[model samples]
Target chain A: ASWFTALTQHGKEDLKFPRGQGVPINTNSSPDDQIGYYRRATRRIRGGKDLSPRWYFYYLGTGPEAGLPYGANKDGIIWVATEGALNTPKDHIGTRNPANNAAIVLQLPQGTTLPKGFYA
Target chain B: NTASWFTALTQHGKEDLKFPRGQGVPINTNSSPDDQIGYYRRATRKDLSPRWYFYYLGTGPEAGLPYGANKDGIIWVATEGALNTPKDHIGTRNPANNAAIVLQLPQGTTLPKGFYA
Candidate 1:
């Protein structure tokens, strides 16, 4: 499936989760701070019985001007749902985890290669 | 609705022509960069339909890295009806509050192939 499919398919029920349940991970250092960031959260379903992990990547902007451009800050979240169990509520695959589960599920940023195949 | 708007815009003989939602129209091959700049400028006008938005991706000193700083210019349009804000592949969206980025083409970078004449 295409990137749009991946985002809409998984995040359809994302609103159900409490706002505090989401975790934010910074992908780049300061100055280039707002370019991209990751958020990991778990969705609850069936009267708060079943849970599934949802990962989202937001491309805020090109650099320091991130989120400053006109209409650039809204609906930038590209998400994917996974069935695998996370070790902890805060644990995510992209930054510290060498396994990098995000790399397997979606194309991520590397050097000049921005994250591709994402719904914009 | 987008087709009607596009047809109407084209009939005006303006350089800033609208496209069908989520479609990318080629830049005018015969037009100069100054002429093509109108598209980017008109994209931010408030008189246009709110659902239809326009963006340009091209190369030049003013153009940023990756997609923006390309060797050629391509005009992209999107129609966001009840959906969240829409953006280009590189995250450029309609400028609601801020000023629009006027794209500059690279020196000697001629109009790309498949562009409209």
Candidate 2:
């Protein structure tokens, strides 16, 4: 447990889907869509399947000698399951067809607007 | 018996969805670009499926052209299991190979919502 614990700590919890805090989830559904799920992540493991209406993942960390004592605390490495998610799978989507279903890798100027492929 | 992980599968390059825009054809199966149909990823310790969660992300207001295309729009069901997993790799049929644990949803049931493949 200690070895695993040393990898990364839980940064945030169930922060809602699609990025809406007040937007409640469809609790009527079996798993709901509004609720948030947990994401298990490390340097390369972004446990995205763990996310759901009631669970998800979040990370927090400073830059690796990128800037001054900054606020990149909400940054770290991550893994992924679905391509729609951030960081883990850069080029993916939940489409019945694979053609034309692409994703964008938007990055930011050290945490402003998500630079190119910011998550990968 | 206890299992840590299992494999759920959708047909390789499966597509059966209709976005708000586009022709909205339910074409199942795709190996073209990168569109998986849909599956589940509950950390059902008992289920051994993949895991999932959500994070609100939007660059602008509806840059709709290609569904889920760079800074795109579309509800997605994703997980953090295998890397570069074959788009159609569902990890079903439970074959024995070093106990290879594929990341897939339960078999014999419709995939969950937010899921495409």
Candidate 3:
């Protein structure tokens, strides 16, 4: 009962420790191992079985699946291109705002081609 | 401490507790912070105030869905489609009916209602 005695029910937990940020990069593992873990976990929380990497793309106030109260989803992309050199702030993250409309790169898996529905 | 805990206890231990009178717009969060949070009361007309609330952030293609960043240094995705159940953008269709959304938590972390770490 000593363990039980120390417990105090409170609401401070959410505010004190916000989510998404702190993570350790496992240099030894492949990219799939890293991407798969987060996608798997996120899909479960969404209560979905369609575990494509696409399932994770969500818009503001929107759910995992795109095309809802909004018009279309933009998460689907087969390639990403960049015009500038490396090491600039734009090279890193040109303002998280999609509205900024900065030239961003969307990289796809090697040896993969864009699907028919991707453009139309 | 045990004695103090016992003294403060309500009638039952391990009671099946419901979410407090009001908490709204539930999301899994999965230990992430969302910016552009907006909330509204469950209903209106006869009610003066509501304890229950709903919340959302801007990240989608919609107007209210804006973008924000995290120190996490990585782009991650979460499926939020199913989350928009029972309640639409405006409010519930029928106020008389009861509505609730379940927020899934990681294994071994089961507390029905509260902010998470």
**Of the candidates shown, which would achieve the greatest DockQ relative to the real structure?**
2
In model 1 chain B, which range of ten residues has the least summed lDDT? B2-11
Instruction: Provide the TM-score for each candidate, comma-separated.
Output: 0.22, 0.17, 0.16
Ranking of all predicted structures according to TM-score, beginning with the best and ending with the worst:
1, 2, 3
Cα RMSD for candidate 2? 19.7
lDDT of 2 by residue, B13-117 (tens): 223322232222223233222333322222222122233321111111221222244322234332222122333343222333334233433333254344422
Tell me the DockQ of each model, to 2 decimals: 0.02, 0.04, 0.01
Question: Over the stretch A5-58, how does candidate 3's per-residue lDDT look in tens digits?
Answer: 111112222111012211112222122111110111112335734332221222
Once fitted onto the true fold, the runs of candidate 3 whose alpha carbons sit more than 4 angstroms away are A1-120, B1-94, B108-117
Deviation from truth (RMSD, Å), model 1? 18.7
- The whole-model lDDT of each prediction reads 0.28, 0.25, 0.23
Stronger candidate by TM-score (1 vs 3): 1
lDDT tens digits, residue span B34-64, model 1: 3222122122221322122223333222234
**Could you give the DockQ of candidate 2?**
0.04
The residue-by-residue lDDT of candidate 3 on B3-96, one tens digit each, is 1100110111122222322222244353233321323222222122112233333222122432223312112222333332222243322323
- The chain B TM-scores of all candidates, as shown, are 0.22, 0.19, 0.22
Best by TM-score: 1
TM-score of chain A of 1: 0.25
